[PDB]
Design a protein around this ligand. Structure first.
Ligand SMILES: C[C@@H](O)[C@H](NC(=O)c1ccc(C#CC#Cc2ccccc2)cc1)C(=O)NO
Ligand SMILES: C#Cc1ccc(C(=O)N[C@H](C(=O)N=O)[C@@H](C)O)cc1
Ligand SMILES: [Zn+2]
Length: 300
């Protein structure tokens, strides 16, 4: 039986918040079967829990956030969330003593190492997958995202950039998902931003944790970071990282074929909710027989 997974031990890291520019302490905790992914603010007293659920997401100006019933929020969850998907973590409590997850280097890679430090504990309860069994498509003008039936997990992402620092041969990315592929191809791809916009935000007391150390920054013409890009197509790799984090907001791996054009957090979440709302478009599946498990979701 393919089992749910949590961490073996509690681990911590510190880093600055993108929004606040202050030091945030991130604590990752084991959790029992079926409890899912929980984000928790411990700056607030009493602490506030935010279960990861598609309906709770908001696409904020910077990154994303989860909200509770009172519109209290926890922000910048999606890069860590993508790392959870990458390493096949099902149940976990994620605490920060702040309103946001630390931005780290702008990618998911620092979370990969943190999760490896925490180890894996297999729990004695079947891991449930969401199997796509009907095609589901959503649109926003010229943008679209769709899931189609497919015995695996694939992502085909095109971005539509007209920035000079992003060439045509670097506008689409497609991959068969796996833990190894996520770790090596995707996890180090950093977020990105427009310098003038960042300057504007920082002039209004926002995005104060922004630096060259946490993002690719371009002006009108070029990448400003001294060392350039980690991948020639880092921008689209990062948007695939974001899609993986967006989709895992349901707390389950999805067996299907994901294709998106000029999609982003809002449209990805729109697709996720559309699928889940259509009772006949999907079903939970488990694998009592390990061998039936699609290649995409084999352990790291
Ligand atoms: C990609 C998009 O969807 C999104 N990224 C953001 O919203 C975002 C916005 C700003 C920054 C930044 C910065 C900075 C800086 C800096 C550099 C040098 C000097 C001063 C400031 C990073 C991410 C994202 O990746 N969501 O997952
Ligand atoms: C707050 C805020 C804020 C949010 C978004 C923008 C924005 O759309 N900036 C433009 C843009 O082209 N960015 O790449 C042009 C105007 O540079 C500007 C300010
Ligand atoms: Zn991102």
């Amino acid at each position: 039986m393919i089992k749910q997974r949590t961490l073996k031990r509690i681990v911590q890291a510190t880093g600055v918040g993108l929004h606040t520019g202050k030091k945030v302490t991130l604590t990752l905790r084991p959790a029992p079967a079926n409890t899912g992914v929980i984000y928790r603010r411990t700056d607030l007293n009493p602490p506030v829990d935010f279960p990861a659920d598609a309906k709770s997401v908001r696409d904020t100006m910077l990154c994303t956030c989860l909200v509770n019933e009172h519109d209290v929020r926890i922000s910048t969850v999606e890069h860590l969330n993508a790392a959870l998907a990458g390493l096949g973590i099902d149940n976990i409590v994620i605490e920060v003593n702040a309103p946001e997850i630390p931005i780290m280097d702008g990618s998911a890679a620092p979370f990969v190492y943190l999760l490896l430090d925490a180890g894996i504990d297999e729990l004695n309860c079947a891991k449930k997958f969401v199997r796509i069994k009907e095609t589901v498509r959503v649109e926003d003008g010229d943008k679209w995202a769709e899931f189609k039936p497919y015995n695996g997990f694939s992502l085909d992402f095109t971005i539509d950039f007209n920035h000079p620092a992003i060439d045509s041969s670097n506008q689409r990315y497609a991959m068969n998902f796996s833990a190894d592929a996520f770790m090596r191809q995707i996890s180090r791809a950093r977020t990105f931003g427009f310098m003038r916009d960042i300057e504007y935000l920082q002039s209004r007391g926002l995005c104060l944790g922004g630096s060259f150390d946490c993002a690719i920054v371009v002006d009108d013409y070029r990448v400003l970071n001294e060392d350039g890009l980690r991948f020639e197509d880092e921008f689209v790799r990062h948007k695939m990282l974001d899609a993986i984090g967006d989709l895992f907001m349901c707390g389950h791996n999805i067996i299907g074929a994901f294709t998106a054009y000029k999609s982003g957090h809002a449209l990805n979440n729109k697709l996720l909710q559309a699928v889940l709302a259509k009772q006949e478009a999907w079903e939970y599946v488990t694998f009592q027989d390990d061998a039936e498990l699609p290649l995409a979701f084999k352990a790291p």
